[PDB]
Enzyme design. Structure first.
Site, PDB file in Angstrom:
ATOM      1  N   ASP A  33       0.911  -1.019   0.024  1.00 29.49           N
ATOM      2  CA  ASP A  33      -0.249   0.010  -0.063  1.00 29.49           C
ATOM      3  C   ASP A  33       0.921   1.126  -0.011  1.00 29.49           C
ATOM      4  O   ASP A  33       1.371   1.761   1.133  1.00 29.49           O
ATOM      5  CB  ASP A  33      -0.908  -0.039   1.164  1.00 29.49           C
ATOM      6  CG  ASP A  33      -1.899   1.207   1.367  1.00 29.49           C
ATOM      7  OD1 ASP A  33      -2.123   1.920   0.302  1.00 29.49           O
ATOM      8  OD2 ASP A  33      -2.737   1.052   2.443  1.00 29.49           O
ATOM      9  N   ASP A 216      -1.540   5.711  -5.348  1.00 32.25           N
ATOM     10  CA  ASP A 216      -1.948   4.951  -4.148  1.00 32.25           C
ATOM     11  C   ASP A 216      -2.190   3.653  -4.656  1.00 32.25           C
ATOM     12  O   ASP A 216      -3.255   3.085  -5.432  1.00 32.25           O
ATOM     13  CB  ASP A 216      -2.944   5.566  -3.819  1.00 32.25           C
ATOM     14  CG  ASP A 216      -3.582   4.712  -2.560  1.00 32.25           C
ATOM     15  OD1 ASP A 216      -2.805   3.502  -1.949  1.00 32.25           O
ATOM     16  OD2 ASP A 216      -4.540   5.020  -1.740  1.00 32.25           O
TER      17      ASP A 216
HETATM   18  C1  LIG Z   1      -5.458   1.411   4.441  1.00 36.49           C
HETATM   19  C2  LIG Z   1      -6.096   1.533   2.957  1.00 36.49           C
HETATM   20  C3  LIG Z   1      -7.060   0.251   2.902  1.00 36.49           C
HETATM   21  C4  LIG Z   1      -7.650  -0.585   3.841  1.00 36.49           C
HETATM   22  C5  LIG Z   1      -8.263  -1.832   3.667  1.00 36.49           C
HETATM   23  C6  LIG Z   1      -8.294  -2.089   2.459  1.00 36.49           C
HETATM   24  C7  LIG Z   1      -7.697  -1.497   1.268  1.00 36.49           C
HETATM   25  C8  LIG Z   1      -7.801  -2.295   0.057  1.00 36.49           C
HETATM   26  C9  LIG Z   1      -8.926  -2.974  -0.447  1.00 36.49           C
HETATM   27  C10 LIG Z   1      -9.127  -3.539  -1.531  1.00 36.49           C
HETATM   28  C11 LIG Z   1      -8.514  -3.149  -2.560  1.00 36.49           C
HETATM   29  C12 LIG Z   1      -7.207  -2.425  -2.414  1.00 36.49           C
HETATM   30 CL1  LIG Z   1      -6.132  -1.950  -3.671  1.00 36.49          CL
HETATM   31  C13 LIG Z   1      -6.958  -1.932  -1.204  1.00 36.49           C
HETATM   32  C14 LIG Z   1      -7.100  -0.437   1.494  1.00 36.49           C
HETATM   33  N1  LIG Z   1      -5.157   1.886   1.961  1.00 36.49           N
HETATM   34  C15 LIG Z   1      -5.524   2.866   1.099  1.00 36.49           C
HETATM   35  N2  LIG Z   1      -4.561   3.099   0.233  1.00 36.49           N
HETATM   36  C16 LIG Z   1      -6.773   3.611   1.102  1.00 36.49           C
HETATM   37  C17 LIG Z   1      -7.878   2.877   1.892  1.00 36.49           C
HETATM   38  O1  LIG Z   1      -7.133   2.463   3.175  1.00 36.49           O
END
Ligand SMILES: C[C@]1(c2cccc(-c3cccc(Cl)c3)c2)N=C(N)CCO1
Length: 372
Positions: A33, A216
């Site tokens: 991430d 992102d």
């Molecule tokens: C921490 C998280 C996150 C938290 C939980 C799941 C994801 C997630 C879920 C499905 C697809 C993807 Cl690419 C990420 C992302 N990461 C981000 N960049 C934006 C939203 O917040």
């Protein structure tokens, strides 16, 4: 070469890397991430977890005696901070001690069938929870090893690669174009122009970056500020006029399906995002095909057809160049030089008529500052 093909997953549920935590090593799949800064792992049973970090089984674990609460827009988790030994089996040949948020309670966070048990937040300390004093994984990795302060991501549609410490030339073709990192929190960048099928949106460029623009890997869609999103939907609908889809489709809520192999790719326009270059008023563009913004949704029940979700959505937190955008490009997170590089990857999106591209340079003598 030993780091090539070290990722699994898809844009819809995320891309993950295998990591080990604790002594003896506990293997976990971890979401890559670039949109967050905590290393957080499932540390208690949950209906959606195949496995979880068992701290009592790690003799190298150190409890920091500090809790952490992390709410998101659609979900949240609570946990305990500690440190332990971490390694990336198909990454650099090193073991480091790093902060670990042991998730003990969560709501609408873990996803059934995602095949991942934690998140590797690769952004900067500024957006770390509880605050900027909790050193992120990558900063620890750099501090403790001789690993260069750079990583690259090659996300592939249908796994991919995460290369830490360098640039792998076999993962891209053509030139690598750099955009500056505007501020070290998220990987914030500046979009200077937006075209949809060669037609400029004509807005003041500050609108493209209201209130920030980020790269992102942890967001599926291309997310756009309200004004830009509405103009993009108008343009895409106008190009695709031979076919009329419900508003649910444009809202990203419902699927559009066509008989297997018949998706009318040609009716959908290409999107060009011009990113700020390294020299004043020079830019480069990345071109996004419908094979990227129309996200395939695999489902055995709908498999006589090819079904997709519209992977562009409205944002009230600025532009997000998500995984659908990164797919087909080799994205270089050059922290050492405070810049992000883009090049066409080996897994780029193309058909007989159109190809995803990274082109430059473009000049705009008549330009203001596009940042908010
Ligand atoms: C921490 C998280 C996150 C938290 C939980 C799941 C994801 C997630 C879920 C499905 C697809 C993807 Cl690419 C990420 C992302 N990461 C981000 N960049 C934006 C939203 O917040």
């Amino acid at each position: 070469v030993e780091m090539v093909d070290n990722l699994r997953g898809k844009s819809g549920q995320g891309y993950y890397v295998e990591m080990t935590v604790g002594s003896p090593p506990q293997t976990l799949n971890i979401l890559v991430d670039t949109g967050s800064s905590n290393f957080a792992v499932g540390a208690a049973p949950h209906p959606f977890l195949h496995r979880y970090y068992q701290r009592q089984l790690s003799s190298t674990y150190r409890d920091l005696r500090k809790g952490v609460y992390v709410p998101y827009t659609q979900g949240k988790w609570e946990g305990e901070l500690g440190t332990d030994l971490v390694s990336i089996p198909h990454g650099p040949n090193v073991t480091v001690r790093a902060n670990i948020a042991a998730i003990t309670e969560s709501d609408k966070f873990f996803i059934n069938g995602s095949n991942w048990e934690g998140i590797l937040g690769l952004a900067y300390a500024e957006i770390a929870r509880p605050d900027d004093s909790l050193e992120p994984f990558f900063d620890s990795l750099v501090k403790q090893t001789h690993v260069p302060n750079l990583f690259s991501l090659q996300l592939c549609g249908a796994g991919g690669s995460m290369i830490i410490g360098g640039i792998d030339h076999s993962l891209y073709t053509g030139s690598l174009w750099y955009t500056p990192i505007r501020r070290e929190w998220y990987y914030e960048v500046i979009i200077v122009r937006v075209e949809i099928n060669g037609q400029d949106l004509k807005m003041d460029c500050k609108e493209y970056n209201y209130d920030k623009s980020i790269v992102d890997s942890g967001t599926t869609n291309l997310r756009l500020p309200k004004k830009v999103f509405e103009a993009a939907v108008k343009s895409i609908k106008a190009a695709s006029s031979t076919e009329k889809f419900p508003d649910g489709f444009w809202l990203g809520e419902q699927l559009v399906c066509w008989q297997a192999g018949t998706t009318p790719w040609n009716i959908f326009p290409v999107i060009s995002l011009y990113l700020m270059g390294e020299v004043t008023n020079q830019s480069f563009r990345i071109t996004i095909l419908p094979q990227q913004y129309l996200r395939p949704v695999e489902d055995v029940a709908t498999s006589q057809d090819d079904c997709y979700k519209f992977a562009i959505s409205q944002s009230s937190t600025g532009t997000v160049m998500g995984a659908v955008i990164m797919e087909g490009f080799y994205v270089v997170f050059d922290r050492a030089r405070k810049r992000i590089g883009f090049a066409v990857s080996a897994c780029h999106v193309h058909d007989e008529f159109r190809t995803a591209a990274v082109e430059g340079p473009f000049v705009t003598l008549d330009m203001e500052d596009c940042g908010y």
